[PDB]
């Protein structure tokens, strides 16, 4: 699950 | 313990994690949101979705913006200096 909200970034590594 | 040192040996061509968080967000330290099956992270069997990354090869991620922390991890995977990455992680939530 995400703890940050949609505007905040996700980076695939 | 509050934190656990997890060594992720580069056993596959990919690392296979997705992270959220950083100093510029309400999740001050990077947090793992996805672990792809077949990547080096899933292969080690010790990393989990929800793990908060305190350190990468002894370097603190506190104060680093999301993209800076992601770049630290990407460079730790690409470097030829060593064939693993040491992640200091916690299963506890970190909100400050």
UniProtKB/Swiss-Prot annotation, chain A:
Name used for this protein in its record: Unconventional myosin-XV
Residues spanning the membrane: none
Tissues expressed in: In the developing inner ear, expressed in cochlea and vestibular apparatus. Expression appears to be restricted to cochlear neurosensory cells and upper epithelial layer of macula saccula. Also expressed in macula utriculi and cristae ampullaris of the semicircular canals. In adult cochlear hair cells, highest expression in stereocilia and apical body.
Purpose of the protein: Myosins are actin-based motor molecules with ATPase activity. Unconventional myosins serve in intracellular movements. Their highly divergent tails are presumed to bind to membranous compartments, which would be moved relative to actin filaments. Required for the arrangement of stereocilia in mature hair bundles.
Disease link: Defects in Myo15a are the cause of shaker-2 (sh-2), a condition causing deafness, circling behavior, head tossing and hyperactivity. Auditory hair cells of affected animals have very short stereocilia and a long actin-containing protrusion at their basal end.
Interval of the full protein contained in this chain: 3499 to 3511 of 3511
Family: Belongs to the TRAFAC class myosin-kinesin ATPase superfamily. Myosin family.
SS bond list: none
Subunit-level organization: Interacts with the third PDZ domain of WHRN which is necessary for localization of WHRN to stereocilium tips. Interacts with FASLG. Interacts with EPS8.
Taxonomic placement: Eukaryota, Metazoa, Chordata, Craniata, Vertebrata
Compartment list: Cell projection, Stereocilium; Cytoplasm, Cytoskeleton
Curated annotation (Swiss-Prot), chain B:
Ranges in a coiled coil: none
Phenotype upon gene inactivation: Mutant mice for isoform 1 appear viable and comparable to their wild-type littermates in growth characteristics, reproductive performance and general health. At 2 and 9 months of age, knockouts show a profound hearing loss across all cochlear frequencies. At 28 to 33 months, they show signs for retinal degeneration such as a thinner photoreceptor nuclear layer and outer segments shortened.
Tissue note: Expressed in the retina. Colocalizes with RPGR in the photoreceptor connecting cilium, a thin bridge linking the cell body and the light-sensing outer segment (at protein level). Detected in the inner ear throughout development from embryonic day 12 to 20 days after birth. Displays a dynamic pattern of expression after birth, demonstrating an ordered appearance and fade-out across stereocilia rows. Isoforms 5, 6, 7 and 8 are not detected in the retina.
Domain of life according to the entry: Eukaryota
Domain PDZ: from-to ranges: 5-88
Subcellular localization: Cytoplasm; Cell projection, Stereocilium; Cell projection, Growth cone; Photoreceptor inner segment
Residues that span the membrane, as ranges: none
Associated clinical condition: Defects in Whrn are the cause of the phenotype whirler (wi). Mutants are characterized by deafness due to malformation of the cochlear inner and outer hair cells and by circling behavior. Stereocilia are shorter and wider than in wild-type animals and there is a decrease in the number of actin filaments in inner and outer hair cells. The number of outer hair cell stereocilia is reduced with increased spacing between them.
Function (record text): Involved in hearing and vision as member of the USH2 complex. Necessary for elongation and maintenance of inner and outer hair cell stereocilia in the organ of Corti in the inner ear. Involved in the maintenance of the hair bundle ankle region, which connects stereocilia in cochlear hair cells of the inner ear. In retina photoreceptors, required for the maintenance of periciliary membrane complex that seems to play a role in regulating intracellular protein transport.
Assembly and interaction partners: Forms homooligomers. Interacts (via C-terminal PDZ domain) with MYO15A; this interaction is necessary for localization of WHRN to stereocilia tips. Interacts (via C-terminal PDZ domain) with MPP1/p55. Interacts with LRRC4C/NGL1. Interacts with MYO7A. Interacts with RPGR. Interacts with EPS8. Interacts with CASK. Interacts with CIB2. Component of USH2 complex, composed of ADGRV1, PDZD7, USH2A and WHRN. Interacts (via PDZ domains) with PDZD7; the interaction is direct. Interacts (via N-terminal PDZ domain) with USH2A (via cytoplasmic region). Interacts with ADGRV1/MASS1 (via cytoplasmic region).
Protein name: Whirlin
Section of the entire sequence shown: 823 to 918 of 918
